[PDB]
Design a protein around this ligand. Sequence first.
Ligand code: MG
Length: 646
Amino acid sequence: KKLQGILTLGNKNSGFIRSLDDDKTVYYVHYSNLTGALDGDLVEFCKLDKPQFGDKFDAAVITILKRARILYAGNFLVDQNEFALEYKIVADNPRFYLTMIVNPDSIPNNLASNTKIAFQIDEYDPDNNLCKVSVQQVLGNNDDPLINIKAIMLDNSIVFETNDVVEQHANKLSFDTEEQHKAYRQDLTDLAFVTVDPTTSKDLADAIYVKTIPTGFVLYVAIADVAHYVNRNSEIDIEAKHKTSSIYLPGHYVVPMLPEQLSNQLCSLNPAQKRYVVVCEISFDNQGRIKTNKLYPATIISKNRFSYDQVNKWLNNKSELNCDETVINSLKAAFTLSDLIQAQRQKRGTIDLSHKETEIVVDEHYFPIKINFLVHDKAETMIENLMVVANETVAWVLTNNKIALPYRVHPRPSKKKLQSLIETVGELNITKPQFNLDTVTSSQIASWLNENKDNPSYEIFVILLLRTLGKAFYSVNPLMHFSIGSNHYTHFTSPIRRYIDLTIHRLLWMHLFTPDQFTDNERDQLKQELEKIADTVNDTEIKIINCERNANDYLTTLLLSKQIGKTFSGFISAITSFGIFMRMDENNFDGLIKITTIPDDFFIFEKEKMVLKGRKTNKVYKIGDRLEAKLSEIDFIQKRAILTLI
RNA sequence: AAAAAAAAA
Ligand SMILES: [Mg+2]
């Protein structure tokens, strides 16, 4: 018969097709055999008669079954030649390789050159890779960095435009004063809950209070009661389900999963306002082992809105925070519990995969200024520990009550991927591990990292381990979370900005808090949808991560384009057939050193060790080597910084 | 070129 699979385009816009079969078989397809297909398209293909060159079969596309996109971002150009106007579009995406004939009836008379637009394909000629396109949206000035970020979101299918019906529905909502007197809702408004968040955030989902008892501690994790305001399958909910999460882009810019009157006002646990929450209350003994837990709706008043910067500076006795003594005692008790919890998590097995992370600072016109390294201090570590224990507790409560739910899962990595990792890292003098590769535990990977922290190449070690370990995702099947270290885990603590957390809250309400206010058909309708919700969230998480990486590259190469001629030190992060990727120390960005212009020899890529070796002199470039290199150009088409060795 | 845990965002 005929085969079917998804096309992925890479270097030079050749690529491969991943079949939909059981084996997920991979076939190579050269540019010349794409027959009009674009990156991400689902295609029908045939396997060519020609004998396999090696590695895998080569393929050709027969037809396109379903396009990955309907709109594409691009730059519109107009010029006058003779007495006739000429239109051109240059697609933002370098994998959009078709030559475009612009339908003139789609061009407003007032559309000026160098305007970012979105277009659709009206027709295509598979034999010449030329197509007719129509402008569908005018986005704005092509030189404005914010317009390019919005184009990137559009190119990744990420909704960002205001939805007028949804904003009007959200503006109708208000605080129901009578909800707090419900018998099922515990009044906790006297307790000294507080919030600790980055200084600029206005969506505050979580508040904490920790009390000491003679036998140990009681922790209160209060999470904004989003399900109270957002009814399932309402206009607001449907839009939230489409987004699946809030998006945070550089420089301030947030696309919220929920509109602002909810995300930053009615649900945000803002200081001094009465707010409805769902509380996970956990009592601990003096060893930090969970003794009991209860979940229940409540009312709170946050007493203080703190930043991470404020709490960390207070920790080092440099400055101090203006709050009641009950808050001070809760914060001190929260830190004691958090250090204690951290110790219990390491004992049970948990993999600390921390590494360098960055953010891009932009000015008032969205132009990038500099790159900052992020820190993850005690206060951020403290909140993280309390949020993890609540998430894990809720996962177990729902499982124990036999309620189907979406877990946050992370499977054990395969034996083959680990062995591949082991060989790669031996050239970096990372110890060979002693554990069994089929059975290796979280505890054993953590110990393995530990016996190597002082190695100069520990940073790239963690990078390679992170790729070996792979993606976490959501699943209704009760799979383990290998890197966190638990057999059951979910996302409960952030429903203002993640749709899964909202779903978890709904499950709590419908099965445990007020099952009597819902019918069995409501419970079964949600149960039947869980796997589709997990699928959409997983698919959209990929799009968001790709969107962030596009924006990081666009903004970082735009910033470096003004620093041509500076020399940067760094280390080799990857070796490819077309050259070396070097990660620059000062900005954590990978630049490309093209193979052809490496000095002193002619270098050949050898896939065996993933090195470049010089045909004479035996010079070897390998992953991890320290380098110094010159910034020679910015490739604005592919958004790669190109470097030359010094 | 390829890709990633956790947490607050
Ligand atoms: Mg928070």
